[PDB]
């Protein structure tokens, strides 16, 4: 209230309001979901259009052959962070000839976000990200929040009314974890789970977006007729 | 991090006052009295060594400072601001004069430098003005003896005699009465000692009083012999003993 002027100020209860406000942009964001088995990790995201004459804002970005993310909140901030991540995956290749561990991708994002929460004139990132990857220790899913907090999960969701999908996934846990070596089956559980967050509208062809990565599949993205298969 | 205070901390009020220079002078007002008197063959500067505790050794605290062999200074206001000004004043006498001309700067010019530093603290980003006024006393070959006052604004003025700080209004009045254009140096020392008694409360002796002169050359104070055109400093701090001698014939 008197303490929400900038990121360099603490409230008297010990909070950072500019960070929590940044968190708010995420909640206004359209829902996206992530989940994984042991063999694949999936992103499903709901795309939002401006009006019926506009295209549907892309929500999924590829970072490397083995890793990528979905976004909810400020788009340009995701572009910046996904770009940073592309660089780090790439540096790791060129220098060490090594695919970047998803766990490390997490730490790097955390430390980049954090700096903008401790210094004057900056501003926190106004976006949340779900990172999936298949690295040297299997399938992975990550939740990034611009507080700096990064978390590894079997599944999760963020955006507007994500809480439905998140509880659905909490129930469905022991089923989807073991959808090993069946790609279309893991996607279905993604599509199903995202539906627990739909209200008054449902999934169409140019509205839904799915990405998958795993054991013998590069991070690739499906939209348009390529998702017809799943509605 | 770093000084992100790149803007002025002293600015014009709608009345056209510069607040921080005004307040710095208020800090000078509170300060202990000091004075300067210009005789025909000398200049005397004096002040009170108002000790902080009786446990402190106030010889270790010098309020009157040599700047060049023929220039000395004294102040009223904030001690620590004076100390750093003396440091910068000594160095600027070298860097921007001696290292160029192979001789020490004349009084008005060294004074002029000090004023510049003080002016800049009145306009630069991220600083307050200095909280002192200075009396600078000195001799140079072509200008003779002189005495100057520098204020926190960075302004300076030449004086026959004057005082600054606490009891200055009283002291300036006293000095007008006694000052003439025919004073021998010993007479001015004598007047300075009287004028200063007004404003000192407790003890008044050669341990509570700091007093230096700009007078004759002092070969005994040179450190070496055999360049007979080098005659030694004209600045001499009077000794504790020396001051008491002049207080018996007071």
């Amino acid at each position: 209230n008197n303490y929400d002027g900038d990121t360099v100020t603490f409230s008297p209860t010990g909070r950072l309001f500019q960070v929590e406000y940044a968190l708010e942009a995420i909640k206004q964001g359209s829902v996206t979901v992530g989940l994984r088995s042991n063999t694949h990790a999936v992103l499903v995201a709901l795309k939002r259009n401006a009006d019926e004459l506009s295209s549907y804002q892309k929500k999924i970005i590829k970072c490397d052959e083995h890793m990528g993310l979905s976004l909810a909140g400020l788009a340009p901030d995701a572009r910046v962070l996904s770009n940073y991540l592309r660089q780090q995956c790439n540096y790791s290749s060129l220098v060490f000839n090594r695919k970047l561990a998803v766990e490390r991708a997490g730490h790097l994002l955390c430390d980049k976000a954090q700096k903008n929460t401790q210094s004057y004139g900056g501003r926190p990132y106004g976006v949340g990200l779900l990172i999936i990857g298949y690295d040297k220790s299997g399938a992975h899913l990550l939740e990034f929040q611009p507080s700096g907090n990064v978390t590894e999960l079997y599944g999760t969701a963020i955006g507007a009314r994500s809480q439905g999908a998140k509880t659905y996934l909490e129930r469905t846990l022991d089923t989807f974890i073991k959808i090993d070596g069946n790609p279309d089956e893991l996607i279905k559980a993604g599509v199903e789970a995202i539906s627990q967050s739909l209200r008054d509208e449902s999934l169409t062809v140019d509205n839904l977006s799915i990405a998958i990565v795993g054991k013998d599949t590069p991070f690739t993205i499906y939209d348009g007729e390529a998702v017809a298969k799943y509605i | 991090m770093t000084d992100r205070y790149s803007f002025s901390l002293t600015t014009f009020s709608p009345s056209g006052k510069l607040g921080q220079i005004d307040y710095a002078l208020t800090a000078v007002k509170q300060g202990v009295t000091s004075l300067g008197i210009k005789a025909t063959n000398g200049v005397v500067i004096a002040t009170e060594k108002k000790s902080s505790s009786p446990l402190a050794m106030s010889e270790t605290l010098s309020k009157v400072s040599l700047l060049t062999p023929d220039i000395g200074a004294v102040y009223s206001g904030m001690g620590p601001d004076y100390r750093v000004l003396v440091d910068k004043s000594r160095k600027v006498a070298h860097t921007s004069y001696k290292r160029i001309y192979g001789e020490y700067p004349p009084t008005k010019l060294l004074v002029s430098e000090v004023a510049k530093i003080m002016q800049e603290a009145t306009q630069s980003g991220g600083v307050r003005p200095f909280g002192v006024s200075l009396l600078i006393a000195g001799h140079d070959e072509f200008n003779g003896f002189s005495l100057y006052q520098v204020d926190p604004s960075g302004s300076y003025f030449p004086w026959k005699a004057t005082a600054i700080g606490k009891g200055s209004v009283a002291a300036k009045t006293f000095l007008e009465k006694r000052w003439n254009d025919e004073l021998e140096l010993e007479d001015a020392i004598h007047i300075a000692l009287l004028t200063l008694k007004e404003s000192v409360e407790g003890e008044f002796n050669g341990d509570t009083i700091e007093l230096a002169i700009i007078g004759d050359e002092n070969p005994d104070l040179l450190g070496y012999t055999g360049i007979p055109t080098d005659k030694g400093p004209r600045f001499r701090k009077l000794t504790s003993q020396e001051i008491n001698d002049r207080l018996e014939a007071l």
């Binding site: 406000y21 401006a50 572009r79 | -």
Partner: protein
């Protein structure tokens, strides 16, 4: 005061949201996409009758295959155009090929968020960027000071926009000819424009694969203005 990079409690950037306001005060700009090309039209809005209206440059070439219309603080656009042109020419120099319309747009939208305590405020102008490229055909883009761009089939920006947009939501279909769309733009402009639409106070332009981006002279538009009144009389 309060920092220029501050978030509101709803999680939006004050300075960006305030810039969105300035754009609403701007002159109207409309664009429509067709399988035969893209049309860009604008309200010139001369603030006095003495000012020479063709000196009002609010439609602007970026490359032979890309054009631009603006709305809001239009002095802010100059440097965005400069950037866009450099990006396009440069891309061609590095790759001996035309720069994609989407890519051009993204490159301009990167500029947008580089402000704070880099420039000192966001831009106060919206852009309609329209052109052709081999891979994705004719495209129209709305570039905002927030850093986000949207593809549209048709779109309006400026004062007359929410009115004009609802209008475009009705009239747009996937099989519009270039000539049909030229007319729509004139029509919707005359509706939302304060003063009465003629060939001096509005301007037309298109971009086709065959002839690239062309601004229409005052004579050519006047005949389209006439042609539109004859259509409107005849029902």
């Amino acid at each position: 005061d309060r920092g220029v990079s501050t978030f509101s409690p709803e999680g939006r950037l004050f300075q960006v949201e305030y810039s969105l306001e300035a754009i609403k005060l701007g002159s109207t700009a409309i664009g429509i996409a067709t399988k035969e090309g893209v049309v860009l039209g604008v309200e010139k809005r001369a603030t006095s009758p003495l000012l020479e209206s063709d000196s009002i440059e609010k439609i602007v070439e970026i490359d032979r295959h890309i054009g631009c219309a603006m709305s809001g603080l239009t002095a802010d656009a100059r440097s965005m155009i400069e950037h866009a042109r450099t990006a396009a020419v440069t891309h061609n120099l590095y790759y001996d090929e035309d720069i994609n319309v989407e890519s051009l747009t993204q490159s301009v939208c990167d500029l947008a968020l580089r402000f704070g305590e880099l420039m000192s405020r966001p831009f106060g102008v919206a852009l309609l960027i329209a052109g052709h490229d081999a891979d994705d055909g004719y495209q129209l883009f709305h570039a905002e000071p927030s850093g986000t761009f949207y593809r549209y089939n048709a779109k309006a920006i400026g004062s007359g926009s929410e009115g004009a947009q609802a209008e475009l939501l009705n009239e747009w279909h996937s099989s519009l000819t270039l000539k049909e769309a030229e007319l729509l733009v004139l029509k919707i402009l005359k509706q939302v424009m304060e003063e009465k639409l003629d060939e001096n106070n509005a301007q037309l332009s298109c971009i086709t694969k065959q002839d690239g981006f062309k601004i229409y002279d005052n004579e050519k538009t006047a005949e389209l203005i006439k042609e539109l009144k004859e259509k409107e009389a005849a029902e």
